[PDB]
Amino acid sequence: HMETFAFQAEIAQLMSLIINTFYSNKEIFLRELISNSSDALDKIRYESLTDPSKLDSGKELHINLIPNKQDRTLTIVDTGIGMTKADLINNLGTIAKSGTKAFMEALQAGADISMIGQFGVGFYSAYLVAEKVTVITKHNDDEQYAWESSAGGSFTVRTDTGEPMGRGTKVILHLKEDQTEYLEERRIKEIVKKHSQFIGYPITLFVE
């Protein structure tokens, strides 16, 4: 059921750089995950214009931010296009390889870690605040999957048995013990207003 895969040497190096470099502006992780959600939502909305049946799995196009203090998790949920098994194992890793190389060169040339999203590898900014990342996803053409990694050179992929999603992606951030500020209502609201205020989809900040 659960399969284990090795990250490509370039992506393992990217993850080590994110985890090891001293960089206090960690809050940019949220903008990067919301932008990936917005790109996924644009994609399913565009596709539905020529094929309305692509919305049979859900008409609603939104982003939900869910903090859970008992679990120490921050979940970013979207009803976007979702990802297939091939996206999780091969496709996105191929894109991430060229993106990492360009990001690495720019950093040596004086660029900042906040600029990560310009190189299409913004997802890995999750490791600035999370010790473990779980990705639950459902694409129209494939089954529901759970991707997972605590870095260290490997990731796992398995068919997900949890609550069926219909269509979209859930990025669950298992926060580091010193990164619990991102579970606070005031902190999340302040970050969304600062970096993600003009997203073209409704963003609901859930409370506890």
Ligand SMILES: Cc1cn(-c2ccc(C(N)=O)c(N[C@H]3CC[C@H](O)CC3)c2)c2c1C(=O)CC(C)(C)C2
């Ligand atoms: C790199 C890259 C981008 N992403 C990503 C994340 C969320 C979403 C999301 N919330 O949906 C996303 N969406 C894309 C999927 C492909 C499509 O063509 C555009 C939108 C992409 C990921 C990567 C990786 O190397 C690891 C990973 C687990 C496959 C996730």
